[PDB]
């Protein structure tokens, strides 16, 4: 059985405030520009997961007002999170994606008559905006995400070329810089679509992921998410076909065959164009403090291992600015005198209030903690599973201060609590 | 007469939690691909009824924590439903359907033409999205559904070919996989329309049904539904015109006749294209626990015969993903190198909380239960129309557990009840 | 104004941007309301050449 | 490596710098901020309306 953290962990009155100051990121929104050396210009987009790993100072090592209250030998200390605020800058906007060579044959919403069959390479330049999403979750461990990937066929008759690949639901760990579902599907677009011309340049060679809430809610300890908030909306603007041989033709008994110019049945693979709706400021989730009181698991906002994970997605501020640089000058506006660039800029401000907590190490409590987590007991005196993973690292070792009123979020906290 | 279940059932303080775990369905969204052998790929769509038949363990044989708290001879036991949660996965989206050859003579919104005559086979490739619908129902017996079917023509003058078929309101049982109405009506499209080119592919060969709320509410005992929620919306996007010989010509007195090419009055059968405005996370019903407090009828959430029926329709997550496979590779993007496939995937996680109840079988109670349902008495010591019906069987015989706080719905239930 | 194609419903590969393909364009802006009170003039932020 | 090369007039990839046109939705009288008094009860900072 699993017990609640309220039993063996006792909280204290020692509150602290920390903040990451301004965080900036500037880069291309579609692909990361790289010269022969490496990525000079990274890839920064508004449809990416932002995963912050904040590293906290060790409670035992750093300075305290007095050590007479706690016992160094029979007790230990951990940091617990009790509030946060995520502040964003830059004006509200909408980001536009697209593909120079996208697979789209006809717009079938409203038409007249038939036209001929597709030739070779019937591809057009298409731009659009995506489904509107904004979410934020917090936890001790990196969150899990699901997608649909190609499956491995066991020993059987060898499949002929062109067959439909088997599908599997794959669960992985979300790292910093992964894309989000955009109303086209939460699937591996690099393995399951070989033509590389069915979705825009953002996700045509990447994996879109969706948060796997069903299983992160069924974790025995619930370290993956303390809390989460989400808001999504979209609608369908346009409808169209695709060009390519149909793997599974329409059954002979579902349609009545036509003659003359209606003989060859047109393609029946229908796709739509997603679109987020009106952007507003009264629907925002950010620039607002959140007070953690009760968690949905058993782990009630207690940070193990002196680190914490914050996952953010915000597509409401995703304007791609456009820059122009003059190569030369001419008489009357030559079009080849200018060079056009795209940038996207992102700004963050993470603020937290933490609380100091103590754990009494009896024999059975020690055995229980060892069963839960061996690294916790090992550290109270190695290779982490985050060796190859990617995160945005934010260090807060020298940024703890008990002058709560001197900082904007501390005053809000003092108003809320009152003491 | 009829008496409420509250009169003759007594409730205990024993609670159990059952979870079906993750459930998946993958298949084609329009039809089912069967080779010469069998049906390898089923038909899975978001516009289908989901009927789960949940099978509970027999409380009599099931080993209770206490067997001495009840009389083994003068009393029996039965499971009473207390609360439930339906969990959906996958991101929100919309699904596009259509017909490669659909009956649409002309556009009449901002076009009206009196030029040439309508020739044979004026059909066009048309794609759309349906009406937005959500509903959830819970009961002991499968729900009733009403549609409009061809009536029986009795001993009378023999009808000529082409006469209007008589209409009848037919009530039936909603089974698994039966479609739902999409803004075209609730009729047997297979029998009332013969051309097979009037509605999209996924309904042009089946029956679309609508729940029969009036009769299910008028039922005396109240076993058809304890609980239902619905939410639907649509609007009319495009107006068009059907092509064919007109059965009932417009009366002379209603119009002033024309001349030249206006002498032939155009078709007067007017149809529209439905749509659903917007999908948003603030209008959803699922991923939320419902506490079944008081039933609408007399059956107050009592499960007779160790059965349960849960009916779900949810069109808010209905994206049809598109997969591509590469037959061959050529120099520069031939269209015939690639094969296109359509798939839909649906994921559930049903969670229930049940309570234990006991019945004292006096003379009046035995007679009343015999009048109501003889199977309940015959079981306490068999041909059933459910034998030939198709549902989704969810077995929970070895998934009952009283460790309430170790499961998410258990935590929500304990917090809500307070005690 | 510098605009070439309406990629919403277009994309035919039948031409290339020549010289001076600018067209007359009108529109309405994003809708805003704001009211600030302070003793000192407020600060503003923009993106400038480095 | 992000695209499969075309042929004929598809050989030269078209422009990929995508821009949109903003627009406010609806002007209404129930969404105004002005023509209504405001009372400064408590300031956010330390300076309390001095």
């Amino acid at each position, epitope marked *: 059985a699993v017990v609640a953290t309220d039993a063996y962990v006792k909280r204290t009155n020692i509150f602290y405030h920390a903040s990451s100051s301004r965080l900036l990121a500037v880069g291309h929104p579609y692909y990361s520009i790289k010269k022969v050396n490496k990525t000079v210009v990274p890839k920064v987009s508004g449809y990416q997961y932002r995963v912050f790993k904040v590293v906290l100072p060790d409670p035992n090592k750093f300075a305290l007002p007095d050590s007479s209250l706690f016992d160094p030998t029979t007790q230990r200390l951990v940091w617990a999170c009790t509030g946060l605020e995520v502040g964003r800058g830059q004006p509200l906007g909408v980001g536009v994606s697209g593909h120079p060579l996208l697979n789209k044959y*006809d*717009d079938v919403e*409203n*038409s*007249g*008559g*038939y*036209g*001929g*069959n597709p*030739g*070779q390479d019937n591809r057009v330049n298409v731009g659009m905006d995506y489904k509107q999403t904004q979410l934020c979750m917090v936890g001790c461990a990196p969150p899990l995400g699901e997608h649909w990937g190609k499956g491995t066929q066991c020993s059987n008759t060898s499949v002929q070329n062109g067959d439909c690949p088997p599908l599997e639901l794959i669960t992985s760990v979300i790292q910093d810089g992964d894309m989000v579902d955009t109303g086209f599907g939460a699937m591996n677009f690099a393995d399951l679509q070989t033509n590389k011309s069915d979705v825009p340049l953002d996700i045509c060679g990447t994996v879109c992921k969706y948060p796997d809430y069903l299983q992160m809610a069924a974790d025995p300890y619930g370290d993956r998410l303390f809390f989460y908030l989400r808001k999504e909306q979209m609608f369908a603007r346009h409808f169209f076909n695709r060009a390519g041989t149909v793997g599974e033709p329409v059954p002979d008994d579902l349609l009545v065959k036509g003659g003359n*110019n209606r003989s060859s049945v047109a393609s029946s693979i229908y796709v739509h164009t997603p679109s987020g709706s009106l952007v507003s400021s009264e629907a925002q989730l950010f620039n607002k403090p959140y007070w953690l009181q009760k968690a949905q698991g058993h782990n009630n906002g207690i940070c193990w291992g002196n680190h914490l994970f914050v996952t953010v997605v915000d597509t409401t501020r995703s304007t791609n600015m456009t820059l122009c640089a003059s190569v030369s000058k001419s008489a009357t506006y030559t079009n080849s005198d200018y060079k056009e660039y795209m940038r996207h800029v992102e700004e963050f401000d993470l603020q937290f209030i933490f609380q100091l907590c103590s754990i009494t190490l009896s024999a059975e409590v020690m055995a229980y903690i060892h069963t839960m987590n061996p690294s916790v007991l090992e550290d109270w005196n190695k290779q982490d599973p985050y060796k190859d993973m990617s995160f945005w690292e934010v260090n807060l070792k020298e940024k703890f201060s008990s002058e709560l009123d001197q900082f904007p979020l501390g005053r809000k906290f003092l108003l809320q609590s009152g003491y | 007469a009829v008496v409420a279940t509250d009169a003759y059932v007594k409730r205990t303080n024993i609670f159990y939690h059952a979870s079906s775990s993750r459930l998946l369905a993958v298949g084609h969204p329009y039809y089912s691909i069967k080779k010469v052998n069998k049906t390898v790929v089923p038909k899975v769509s978001g516009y289908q009824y989901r009927v789960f038949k949940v099978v509970l363990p027999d409380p009599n044989k099931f080993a209770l924590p206490d067997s001495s708290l009840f009389d083994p001879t003068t009393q029996r036991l039965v499971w009473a439903c207390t609360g439930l949660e339906v969990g959906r996965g996958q991101p929100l989206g919309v699904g596009v359907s259509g017909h490669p050859l659909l009956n649409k003579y*002309d*556009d009449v919104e*901002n*076009s*009206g*033409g009196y*030029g*040439g005559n*309508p020739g044979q086979d004026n059909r*066009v*490739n048309v794609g759309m999205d349906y009406k937005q619908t959500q509903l959830c129902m819970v009961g002991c017996a499968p729900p009733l559904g009403e549609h409009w079917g061809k009536g029986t023509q009795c001993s009378n003058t023999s009808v000529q070919n082409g006469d209007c078929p008589p209409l009848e309101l037919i009530t039936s049982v909603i089974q698994d996989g039966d479609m739902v109405d999409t803004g075209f009506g609730a009729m047997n499209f297979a029998d009332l329309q013969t051309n097979k080119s009037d509605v999209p592919l996924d309904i042009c060969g089946t029956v679309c049904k609508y729940p029969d709320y009036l009769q299910m509410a008028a039922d005396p005992y109240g076993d058809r539904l304890f609980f239902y929620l619905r939410k639907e919306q649509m609007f009319a996007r495009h107006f068009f015109n059907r092509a064919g010989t007109v059965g009932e010509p417009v009366p002379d007195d209603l119009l002033v006749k024309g001349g030249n090419n206006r002498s032939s009055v155009a078709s007067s059968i007017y149809v529209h294209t439905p749509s659903g405005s917007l999908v948003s996370s603030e209008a959803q019903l699922f991923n939320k626990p419902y506490w079944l407090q008081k039933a609408q009828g007399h059956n107050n959430g009592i499960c007779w015969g160790n059965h349960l029926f849960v009916t779900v329709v949810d069109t808010t997550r209905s994206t049809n993903m598109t997969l591509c496979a590469s037959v061959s590779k050529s120099a520069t993007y*031939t*269209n*015939s190198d690639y094969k296109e496939y359509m798939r839909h995937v649906e994921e559930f996680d049903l969670q229930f909380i049940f309570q234990l109840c006991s019945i004292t079988l006096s003379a009046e109670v035995m007679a009343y239960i015999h009048t109501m349902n003889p199977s309940v008495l015959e079981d306490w010591n068999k041909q059933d129309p459910y034998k030939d019906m198709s549902f989704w069987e969810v077995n929970l015989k070895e998934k009952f557990s009283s460790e309430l706080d170790q499961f998410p719905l258990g935590r929500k239930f304990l917090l809500q009840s307070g005690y | 104004l510098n605009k070439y194609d309406d990629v919403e*419903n*277009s994309g*035919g*590969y*039948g*031409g290339n941007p*020549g010289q001076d*393909n600018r*067209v007359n364009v009108g529109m309405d802006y994003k809708q805003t309301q704001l009211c600030m009170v302070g003793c000192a003039p407020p600060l503003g932020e923009h993106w400038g050449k480095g | 490596d992000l695209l499969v090369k075309g042929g*004929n*007039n598809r050989s030269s990839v078209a422009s990929s710098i995508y821009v949109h046109t903003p627009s406010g939705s609806l002007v209404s009288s129930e969404a105004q901020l002005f023509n209504k008094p405001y009372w400064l009860q408590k300031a956010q900072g330390h300076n309390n309306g001095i």
Partner: antibody, heavy 122, light 113 residues
Framework: EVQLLESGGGLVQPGGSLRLSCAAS????????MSWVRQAPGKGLEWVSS????????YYADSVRGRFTISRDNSRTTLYLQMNILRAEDTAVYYC???????????????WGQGTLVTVSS | DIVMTQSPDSLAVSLGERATINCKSS????????????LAWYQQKPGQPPKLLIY???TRESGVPDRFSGSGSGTDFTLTISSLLPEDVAVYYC?????????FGQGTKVEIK
């Protein structure tokens, strides 16, 4: 029994504008895509502009793009061409041509109009 | 842009004899999977709109006399009038509709001798 009648030709000063129209008689106008085709006096046939059956999409040539515009009137069954910023090189005869296929159409033409002459000089 | 060149210049054909006209493109027109050549042949008489003769480079229009014929593939195409009559004096054009912009030929003038 399908006919096409054109009207709108005449003289015009350079830099001025003009409008051409084409009317279809015995035809289901809402189905077939259509186009305008120019022919200089004494020269060959040259494409100008094309429109979809429902009027959603249009295509122009490089030398014509930006100045001309093609429009449709299905209720009145008429095809319009608006000419802006005319040059001296556009004096020619214009043809209203009907495609074969419907939605966007394969580019060969069944029936043609009679043609209307446009002159741009002093 | 695909340039279509009509190789034979304006040629005069004797009475009751076959006539041959060659059209050539700067790119391959054939689509290999379906074996379709995107080429059409038009006829125009002096002072009248041109009339369609051949489409898909092989198929013939309704009401067109069987005397005309078309052939070719890839980048070569030929139109042949099997027998010559006085009503066949006209100007013939070859059009490609493989890719935009749709271009016509320079036009060949066919006349009796």
């Amino acid at each position: 029994e399908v006919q096409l009648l054109e009207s709108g030709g005449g003289l015009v000063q350079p830099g001025g504008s003009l409008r051409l129209s084409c009317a279809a008689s015995g035809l289901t106008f809402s189905s077939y895509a259509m186009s305008w085709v120019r022919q200089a006096p004494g020269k060959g046939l040259e494409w100008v502009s094309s429109i979809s059956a429902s009027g959603g999409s249009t295509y122009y040539a490089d030398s014509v793009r930006g100045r001309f515009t093609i429009s449709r009137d299905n209720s009145r069954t008429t095809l319009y061409l608006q000419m802006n910023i005319l040059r001296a090189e556009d004096t020619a005869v214009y043809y209203c041509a009907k495609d074969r296929m419907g939605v966007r159409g394969s580019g060969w033409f069944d029936y043609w109009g009679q043609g209307t002459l446009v002159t741009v000089s002093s | 842009d695909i340039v279509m060149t009509q190789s034979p210049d304006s040629l005069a054909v004797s009475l009751g004899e076959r006539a041959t006209i060659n059209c050539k493109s700067s790119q391959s027109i054939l689509y290999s999977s379906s074996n379709k050549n995107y080429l059409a042949w038009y006829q125009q008489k002096p002072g009248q709109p041109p009339k369609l003769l051949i489409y898909w480079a092989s198929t013939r229009e309704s009401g067109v006399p069987d005397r005309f014929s078309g052939s070719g593939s890839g980048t070569d195409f030929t139109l042949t009038i099997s027998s010559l009559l006085p009503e066949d004096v006209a100007v013939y054009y070859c059009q490609q509709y493989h890719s935009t912009p749709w271009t016509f030929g320079q036009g060949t003038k066919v006349e009796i001798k």
